[PDB]
């Protein structure tokens, strides 16, 4: 549908908007790039391992790859919400979220490329809890805005992805690869990576909690939905945990799973009812 | 509606797909920041500036905004209709052509808040001709990929964005900017900004024509379709051309008339009926 006017042209950006100011810092940290990573020694540290060994590292890997593609792909409807209802600022930002998750996708894939296993579908590493949220909720949440940007719709899409994707699985998956490679002294091209990755998603993260606040804000009620939203999600959460726990006994569990349920509750905390 | 599963799991990347490797030379050639350009010397340029002189700048630069700021919003739909069609390569590159976007109404915001005129309306410069363009026909075909994405759809979305608003008005205003106040010493944090521009925009351009050939390279009769409907906005192109150069009037504009001829014939000629 049409376009009214543009707010450039009556006016200017907002420059003291906190989502301008989150895409200028996304634009001042955001110069990596996953081509200039040097995977050659990771390639030779993945030969070395035995056969056991490789498969180990596969199913972490096989959650990251599908989550980058899946949020860069499930962010679309998100920025067309805010188009439409004329955030300006925000729609800014977030071509710099999205260009931030194809860096993301990207990286994982030419690590895989790298190392050997681009040809291996890891695919079956996706149990029926990751599919509930990866190939079903996520998408799901994020395509309703299309129909309907309620602040309910809304509130319930930056739950599923900001707080549950990236700030409960994905956060949590970053930690364990590091509370396991880094001190094997393994894969530095993949951390190096990771690193990167995880200094662009505290900005993402940022535009999750401003998102939900600013609902919030205009009716307390909804913060009982966003913490419905939350506990709905758990059991698939604790459920995958459980299954990757389970292949890797097939590293403290005990600690990882403790950070995951940390990393939910404060993602609960970062909202203010009031 | 759900993910089947994911291309960085299953396989990886098409390293060697045209819209990888554009969305890599992206990567290399995208890093200038609007935020880092001097418009001081264009503040003083522009208050040095006689009523009558400061006007002649504003019905361009009134059209440029307007449409940074409609390409900025209205890519989301095509990035959209590629991705459900499981065009990943095509998605990371439009990360980059979106994130461009953002920059080049970032730059324009920034110089009309710099020189003094953010405050003015500059909306009385959209004649109806523009109006169609920019207001209408653009957001009309992009928006309509969301529920038909067929290839008589989506050439025709290509066109018109890429082809007659990028294509031949936003490269027609590129150089009558350049054959004006470069030559006139004027407004250098502009021009650089102009210079920036033109480079992301010649990415863009090609992801148009990859666009447009591919749909026309699987049934010649669309080569049909995409020359009707290049003719179809030629009144408003040239009607608003007609309206600036009136305005101007009230600078060689046979020269630039004749440019705006020239980007809409060589448009034509990048597509190929074979
Ligand atoms: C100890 C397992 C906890 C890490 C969560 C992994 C999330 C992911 O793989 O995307
Ligand atoms: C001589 C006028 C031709 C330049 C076309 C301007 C396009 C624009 O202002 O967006
Ligand atoms: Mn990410
Ligand atoms: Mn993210
Ligand atoms: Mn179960
Ligand atoms: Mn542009
Ligand atoms: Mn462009
Ligand atoms: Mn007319």
Redesign the interface.
């Known amino acids: 549908?049409?376009?009214?006017?543009?707010?450039?042209?009556?006016?200017?950006?907002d420059?003291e908007h906190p989502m301008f100011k989150l895409?200028?810092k996304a634009?001042?940290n955001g110069?990596w790039?996953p081509?200039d990573i040097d995977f050659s020694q990771d390639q030779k540290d993945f030969a070395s391992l035995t056969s056991e060994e490789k498969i180990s590292a596969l199913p972490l890997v096989?959650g990251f790859?599908?989550l980058?593609?899946?949020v860069?792909?499930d962010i679309?409807?998100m920025?067309?919400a805010l188009?439409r209802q004329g955030r300006?600022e925000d729609?800014?930002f977030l071509?710099?979220f999205?260009?931030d998750?194809?860096?993301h996708?990207?990286m994982?894939?030419?690590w895989?490329?790298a190392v050997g296993i681009?040809?291996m579908?890891?695919?079956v590493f996706?149990n029926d809890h990751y599919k509930r949220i990866?190939?079903?909720a996520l998408?799901?949440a994020m395509?309703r805005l299309?129909a309907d940007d309620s602040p309910e719709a809304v509130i319930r899409a930056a739950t599923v992805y900001n707080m549950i994707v990236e700030g409960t699985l994905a956060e949590s998956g970053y930690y364990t690869f590091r509370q396991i490679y880094k001190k094997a002294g393994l894969f530095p091209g993949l951390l190096q990576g990771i690193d990167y990755l995880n200094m662009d998603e505290g900005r993402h993260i940022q535009f999750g909690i401003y998102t939900i606040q600013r609902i919030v804000n205009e009716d307390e009620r909804y913060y009982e939905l966003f913490i419905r939203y939350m506990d709905e999600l758990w059991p698939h959460v604790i459920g995958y945990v459980d299954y990757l726990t389970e292949l890797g006994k097939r590293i403290d569990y005990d600690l990882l799973r403790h950070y995951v349920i940390k990393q939910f509750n404060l993602r609960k905390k970062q909202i203010s009812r009031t």
């Open positions: 549908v049409h376009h009214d006017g543009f707010q450039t042209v009556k006016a200017t950006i420059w895409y200028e634009k001042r110069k790039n081509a096989a790859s599908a980058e593609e899946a860069t792909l679309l409807p920025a067309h188009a300006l729609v800014l071509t710099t999205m260009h998750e194809a860096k996708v990207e994982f894939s030419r895989q490329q681009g040809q579908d890891l695919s996706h990866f190939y079903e998408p799901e395509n299309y």
